Structures are given as C-alpha cells and as structure tokens.
Design a binder for this molecule. Structure first.
Ligand SMILES: CCCCCCCCCCCCCCCC(=O)OC[C@H](COP(=O)(O)O)OC(=O)CCCCCCCCCCCCCCC
Ligand SMILES: CCCCCCCCCCCCCCCC(=O)OC[C@H](COP(=O)(O)O)OC(=O)CCCCCCCCCCCCCCC
Ligand SMILES: CC(C)CCC[C@@H](C)[C@H]1CC[C@H]2[C@@H]3CC=C4C[C@@H](OC(=O)CCC(=O)O)CC[C@]4(C)[C@H]3CC[C@]12C
Ligand code: NA
Ligand code: NA
Lengths: 568, 153, 48, 90
C-alpha cells in the first residue's frame, strides 16, 4: 500500500515471498516513494531509522543503500529535521564521498547526492522576498550558509539566480546599476580606477576610517586595482628584459623585489589560514607556490652570485652551472608562471569565464591520456636507443662542435636515452628530419628498421593517438558544456567571495536564539510552499500509466455490480 | 561567420599565452643579441636562411612564437653562440611547453569548441541564412540603383 | 532452490515494471469506452 | 542476478558446476552485462583483495606504498612457495 502511494494505509495502520529485502521498514519505503502524506502518517507514529556506521555482504551494502536512500528523500529532510539545508548539504557530501569509496553502486549514490543538491536548490527557489533570502544565507549554526555551501561543493545552490543577485549587490556596492552601464563606460571606470591603486592604497594605510579608506573596502574596487597592480608587475617584468659574474640588482629589480615580497607574504598569509588542505587542493595556489618558490630561488642565487664573485669574466667563458645563468633561467620560467596567472582572471568576465572553466575541466581528461602517450614515448625510445646506441659520435666530429638535435646538422638524436626521448618529442611537430635516422657507417638494414620504427611512432602518435585525443575532447566537451554556467558561477562566487574578507591592501608593497527563531520561521514557509510546489508538479508532470487505467476500470466495474445488485 | 565570434573569444586567451612565453624567452635570451654584420648575408632574425636571433627582442619573440604554431621554426633557433647548455636547455623546454600548450592542448580545444558551436549553429541555419539573404535582397529594392563601376558619378 | 526464488521475484518485478512503465494507448481508451457504453446500455435496458 | 538479495544466493549462482563455474561460462559466452553486474563485482573484489580488510577504504598514498613495498619483495615472496609452500609466506 505504501508503494502505490495509496492513503488507504490508514486502514492498515488502524487495524513467504516478500517482494522486498526483509530490511525494509515502512518509513524507508515511504521515503523511497517520496510521498509527503504517508511519511507524515508514519512520522506521527514515532518510528525510527538506524544509523549506518559500523565498528552477508549484499544485505549489508543493500541495507546501507536503503538507509541512505531513505534519508536522502526530500520529504524526510523537509520533516523531522532541524534545518533541511544543512541536512541536504551534509547528506550530499556523505553520498558523494560514499560514491567515491564504493566502486560498485556508484551511479546510485551519485543520484542520491544530486537529489540532495536539487532539494536544497529548490528550497532557495521558493524564497519570495529578500528578507527571507538574507535570513537563509546568513544563518550561522558574513555569509555563513554560502561558506558552508561552497565548502560542501553545492554548485546549484550557489548559482541560483537570487543568490547571484545578492552576491552581485554585495559585489558592486558603491555602484548604482553597474550592469545598466555601457561597456565603454565600464572600460573607463576599470581603467581610471585601475590607475589609482597608489591613490587608493595610500589611503587605508594613513586614514582607514575616511572617505577614501572606505573606498578600497569595496570588493569590486578590490578586484580592480589588485589586478591592475598585477598588470603593472607584469609590465615591470616586460621592462626587465630591456660582463659581471654576479651584478648588483638593476633599478627594475629593486622596484620588483617588494612586489615579490608582497606575493610571498600574501601566500604565507593564506597558508596561515586553515591548513595545507584547502590551499594545496587549489591548483592556482600550487602555481603560486611554484612561482614564488622560483622567486626565492632566483633572489637567493642573486645573493649567492653577489657573494665572492668579484671579478668580471666574459659571458662565453662561464661554467654551465654558474648560478647567474640558473638565476636568469629560473627567472624566465617564473615569468611564464607569473604571466599565465592572468588566465585565472577570466572567471570574472561573462564571456571568457565558462570557456576558461571548460578548458580547465578538459585538462584533467588530457592528463589521463598523456600517461598512455608517455608510455608510448618510453617504448619507442627504448627501441630506438637500443638500435642506435652503437653509433655515438663525439662532438668534435661534427661541424660547429655541435651534438644532438638543436644543431643545424641534426646528428645524434637516438644516441642516448635522454636525447631519444627529446627526439621523439620533437617529431610530433614537424621538427625532425629523415636524415636523423642515418648512421655514418652506412648500414642500410638498421637504418631501414630504425626508419620503420620512427614511421610507426609517427602513425601511432600523430594519426591514431592525436585524433583519439580529439574525439576524447569532443565527447568530454559535450558533457562539460551542459553543466557550464553553473560550474562557471561557482568559481565566480569563489573569486568574488575571496574579496569580501578583512585583508584589503594590495601586494604592490603596501601589503607590508532570535536568529534561529527567524530562521525556523523562514524554513517553515519554504518547506510548506516547497512541498506544495512538488505535489503540484507531480500532478502536472506525471504521465498516466496502466495501474491508473485499472483504477478507473474497477471504479466503473464496481459501480456496475453495485447498481446491478441494487436493481436485482 | 557565426563561429568566428567564438574563435575571437579564444584568440584572447591564446594571445595571453603568447605573451607569457614571449616574456619568458625574451627574458632568457635578451643577453645574446648579435649584430646583423656577424651573420652571413647581413641578415638578422627569422625570415633569413639562417634563423639567428629570434628570441632577441620582444617583437621578434612574439613573431617567433607565432611562426612555431606552423612548422616554420627550427631547433637551431634556441641556441646561442656562447654554448651555454643549461640556458639553451631551459629555453628549449620553454619552447617545448609552448608547443604542447599551443599545438596539442589549445588547438584541439579550439576544435572541440567549434564542434560544439557548429552543432548549435547548424540547427538555426536556413532561417539565419534567409534573414541575411533578405537583407541582401532588400538592399537592392531602393531607388539608388546607380552602379559603383564609376557610373555612380 | 535459489533459481525458483529468483524467477519468482524476477517475474513479479517485470509485471510491476510493466504496470509502472507502460504508457496508455488507444486500445485502452476503447476498453473504457466499451465499459461505460455497455454499462450504459445495460442500465437503460433494466430501466426500460 | 539483479534479484539476488543475499550472498549465499549469489555464491550458489556463481559456483554452480553443470572455483567459479558460472562466471567461467559467462565469460566463455561473452556475457558482459552479467559479469559487470555490481554484486558479482563485489564478490570478485573480495576474492581479489583477500588478505586486505578494506583496500578501497585506504588512501591512495597508502595504496602506493603497499604497491611499492610488496613490489620490491618478489624474491622475498617467491623464494617462499618454492621451499615452504605450506607456510605463512608460501
Ligand atoms: C588552458 C590553458 C592551457 C592549458 C595548459 C596545458 C596543460 C599542460 C600540458 C602538459 C605540459 C607540457 C609538457 C612539457 C613538454 C615537454 O616535456 O618539453 C619537451 C622537452 C623539450 O625538448 P628538449 O629535450 O630540447 O628540452 O624535452 C625534454 O625535456 C625531455 C623529455 C621529453 C619527454 C616529454 C614527454 C611529454 C610529452 C607530452 C606531450 C606529447 C604530445 C601529445 C601527442 C599526441
Ligand atoms: C592504443 C595504443 C596505440 C594503438 C596502436 C596503433 C595501431 C597501429 C597502427 C598501424 C601501425 C603503423 C604502421 C607502420 C608505419 C610504417 O609502415 O612505417 C613506414 C616505413 C618507414 O619508412 P622507411 O621506408 O624509411 O622505413 O616505410 C616502409 O617500410 C615502406 C612501406 C610504406 C607503406 C606504409 C603504409 C602504412 C601507412 C599507414 C599510416 C598512414 C597514415 C594515415 C594518414 C591518413
Ligand atoms: C591581449 C593579450 C596580450 C592579453 C592581454 C593581457 C591583459 C591585458 C589581459 C589578459 C586577460 C585580461 C583580463 C580578462 C578579464 C578581466 C576581468 C575583467 O572584468 C570583467 O570582465 C567584469 C568584472 C565584473 O563585473 O565582475 C576586467 C579585467 C580582466 C582581468 C582583464 C584585464 C586585462 C587582461 C589581464
Ligand atoms: Na593564492
Ligand atoms: Na608540420
């Protein structure tokens, strides 16, 4: 009677081949059917549900999936729970991790977790004023409920558009209608506020409680002039590229050093917050550790190069591991890493944001493929090194005293393993030549076998694997491009909500019971009109089926036999 | 024409990448500029028979990383005359990661991007086409039919 | 002894799935139409 | 197989010789949905990870350390089962 959602379960509550696993209690099945009336009729009987954790094996995982399947219903969360939003968040998290633990039954616990996320999102859809929405999003058990929603990765909850209007009004404070303006006026405000980061950052150091000290406290006036400041730092790195063994630092480098110290003090300031859990899980903070670690290595090798290197030797006489050349090389790599941080600024823009986050979600599917390709690289480099290691020639024997590839004469590519891996890397692009696979000793069989090995590497790597990577990114990009614009808005609210905190000053160098009664008063209304909207949607959207046909057939049949029994 | 606007959103990001690697390679190789007299045929930079100073200035480095998307640079570009094997190796690894990012990652992401855009565009085609065909047709309905083959004067 | 139980609850699950997942069609409409029509002519033949 | 509601029933199914006879017949007749059914995958996973209480519960760094440290000991685990097959290491 509970399966068919009949409310003739009042008779069965008033007064061998079970078609169920015998773990099933009536409230588990009532929650599996998601009918609010039967769940209320059984919760009013004061029945309980077991807790899943533990100290022959199909009954245990089947019973745990029944318990989590009953707890994840949006009517046992709407009833019998203090607040359904935290319950939907914590159940969505426990079902997501529980899907990641158990390789079997993964597609069902993920379905239950998406049910728990969709429930909380549909609770925000029922807020019909902004007092209710501010009571929801500020409820501390600041914006506490959004911090918990981002903490439990509730992407549909945060990307709900009423929440995006509230975050947009918190974001654009001090701007009456920024989105109403034309984009040329937007560009002029971005540029003119961009030039004034010393004029807005000297204030809040001398006069914090002033008309200008409260103007950098605005988060959109944080984002602009934190990032135009970063464009001035990258402008100093562009300026820096325009003999003494270890020189004193250039006037450009003296200008750059406190930008660098502001970055390192900023990242240590972020590693003090929390721990190495949220910091190391974020890829851009790992890129900050690589960039700033190369800054510490570069400045440290400038200090080491200044110590006891007093003379001046010409450039072409230096050793290979001279710390001046290493400091310049690591400075160049840190310029690539510092100049690729502007990709993370794309999430603030509505055009470049979902594109950038879709590319970031396809990179993890490329990295599953580069392992297989690197195995192929190891295979053919093993074979070609094994065939051509007999034919190493000294660097004196070739013109211009040049060995390997990166010569005008590509001479010994398959000689060592390191040069063979390098050789098969550069042949993916059209940068090797066929004279590479020759030897001086004119052995036509081994040169032919080596050219066939190089040819099958070209077929496997360029025709097979590259186009399989193309088809792989088509099928991944189609899956990613549906969940885009809520995947984008989650990262945009993380970027926005990073600028709401207390530590306003830039890295340019400047760097150096009533609430619960109101919340239950809102939650009661949201649950009531939520459940009314869901029974309304079940009346509109449920298509008719065969058992509904049998109900009409028995009504006409039973009324037929009753009239025939009265008239007979 | 409706996919060009989706390419132009991507060339900004790619130009961001070129800027990054040109900053790094100019920063590493700006110490090794040679005068044009020192090379044969008095030729400097790329667009020479001997590709000699590509990562010397910033404009020539942006040019250099532009021409390496196609198979038109060479590996002898990343050398210096002074035989510094560590900086030539680091510069060749920077050029290699530019080739992986630009040619393997970003180009094929542009391919998948234009697949997913072309599927959306190809449904609204033939009413998107007929609107522009009626704009082209309805441009020739007006009184000003005088011919621009100079008969227009 | 196991196969008998699996067949029995399998067939019960399949008739259950045929009751839930089969959409209504025109012949099911003709069955209701003949039930109301036949009950109509039967009541009119008792009251006439 | 979806209707098996215990593991005694599932072990009676998958061991029925006309060892795992019914899985050998299922792989022999290329029954890919039969074998990939998740209760069968739990039984094959417990037969696979015997001597491991909850391998999937462990973190992948601990997984990597067990893979490496068991990986180095293939003479220390393969000299046993040649000298002492019926032993704690054999
Ligand atoms: C969204 C913005 C962009 C996204 C960022 C993209 C993610 C990064 C992608 C990986 C990073 C590049 C790897 C470094 C390249 C490099 O090693 O650079 C290769 C260097 C360059 O040649 P040198 O020997 O002269 O240095 O070679 C070596 O240092 C020796 C090791 C060679 C082994 C490399 C194996 C990796 C190959 C992966 C690509 C294969 C192509 C695929 C064909 C189907
Ligand atoms: C999943 C992991 C990877 C999957 C494995 C991939 C499957 C293997 C694919 C085929 C194996 C490579 C074939 C050997 C290459 C070779 O012959 O190597 C070619 C050799 C190399 O040249 P040499 O004459 O110098 O040796 O040439 C010859 O020996 C003469 C015969 C040439 C005729 C070859 C015709 C085959 C062409 C197939 C590829 C064409 C490209 C497609 C363009 C659209
Ligand atoms: C042309 C090539 C060489 C790249 C140019 C380098 C920079 C000048 C570009 C690259 C990306 C651009 C950024 C892309 C996106 C944004 C967000 C953008 O903000 C918005 O789109 C709206 C913000 C909001 O309303 O929340 C303004 C600055 C910024 C960082 C842009 C600043 C200029 C950047 C850093
Ligand atoms: Na950071
Ligand atoms: Na090419």
């Amino acid at each position: 009677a509970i399966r068919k959602e009949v409310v003739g379960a009042v008779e069965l509550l008033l007064s061998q081949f079970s078609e169920f696993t015998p773990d099933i209690t009536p409230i588990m099945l009532a929650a599996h059917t998601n009918n609010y009336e039967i769940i209320k009729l059984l919760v009013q009987k004061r029945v309980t549900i077991p807790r899943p954790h533990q100290i022959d094996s199909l009954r245990h995982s089947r019973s745990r999936l029944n318990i989590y399947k009953a707890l994840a219903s949006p009517s046992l969360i709407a009833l019998s729970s203090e607040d359904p939003i935290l319950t939907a968040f914590r159940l969505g998290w426990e079902l997501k991790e529980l899907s990641k633990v158990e390789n079997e039954f993964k597609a069902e616990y993920e379905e239950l977790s998406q049910q728990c996320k969709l429930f909380a999102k549909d609770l925000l859809d029922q807020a019909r004023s902004s007092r209710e929405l501010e009571i929801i999003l500020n409820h501390r058990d600041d914006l506490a409920k959004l911090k918990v929603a981002i903490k439990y990765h509730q992407k549909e909850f945060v990307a709900q558009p009423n929440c995006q209007q509230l975050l947009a009004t918190l974001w654009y404070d001090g701007f009456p209608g920024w989105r109403r303006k034309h984009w040329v006026v937007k560009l002029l405000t971005c540029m003119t506020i961009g030039f004034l980061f010393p004029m807005l950052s000297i204030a809040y150091l001398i006069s914090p409680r002033s008309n200008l000290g409260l103007f950098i406290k605005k988060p959109f006036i944080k984002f602009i002039c934190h990032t135009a400041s970063y464009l001035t730092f990258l402008f100093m790195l562009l300026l820096a590229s325009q003999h003494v063994q270890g020189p004193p630092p250039t006037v450009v480098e003296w200008m750059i050093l406190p930008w660098v110290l502001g970055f390192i003090w900023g990242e240590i300031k972020e590693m003090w917050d929390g721990g190495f859990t949220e910091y190391i899980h974020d890829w851009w903070n790992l890129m900050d550790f690589a960039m700033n670690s190369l800054y510490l290595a570069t400045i440290s090798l400038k200090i080491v190069a200044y110590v006891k290197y007093n003379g001046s030797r010409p450039r072409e006489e230096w050793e290979m591991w001279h710390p001046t050349l290493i400091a310049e090389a690591l400075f160049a790599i840190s310029n690539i890493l510092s100049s690729l941080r502007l990709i993370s600024l794309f999430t603030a823009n509505s055009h470049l944001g979902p594109l950038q986050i879709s590319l970031g979600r396809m990179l993890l599917d490329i990295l599953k493929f580069l392992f297989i390709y690197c195995l192929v690289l190891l295979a053919f480099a093993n074979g070609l090194n094994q065939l051509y290691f007999y034919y190493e020639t000294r660097a004196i024997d070739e013109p211009n005293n040049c060995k390997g590839i990166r010569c005008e004469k590509q001479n010994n590519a398959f000689s060592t393993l390191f040069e063979t891996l390098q050789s098969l890397f550069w042949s993916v692009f059209g940068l090797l030549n066929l004279y590479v696979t020759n030897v001086k000793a004119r052995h036509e069989f081994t040169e032919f076998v080596g050219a066939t090995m190089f040819g099958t590497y070209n077929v496997i790597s360029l025709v097979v694997l590259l186009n399989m990577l193309i088809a792989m990114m088509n099928n991944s990009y189609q899956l990613i491009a549906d969940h885009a614009d809520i995947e984008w808005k989650f990262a945009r609210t993380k970027l926005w909500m990073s600028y709401f905190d207390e530590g306003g000053t830039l890295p340019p160098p400047f760097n150096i019971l009533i609430q619960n009664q109101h919340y239950q008063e809102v939650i009661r209304n949201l649950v009531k009109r939520y459940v009314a909207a869901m029974i309304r949607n079940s009346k509109t959207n449920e298509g008719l089926t065969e058992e509904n046909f049998k109900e009409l057939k028995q009504d006409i049949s039973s009324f037929r036999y009753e009239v025939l029994d009265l008239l007979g």
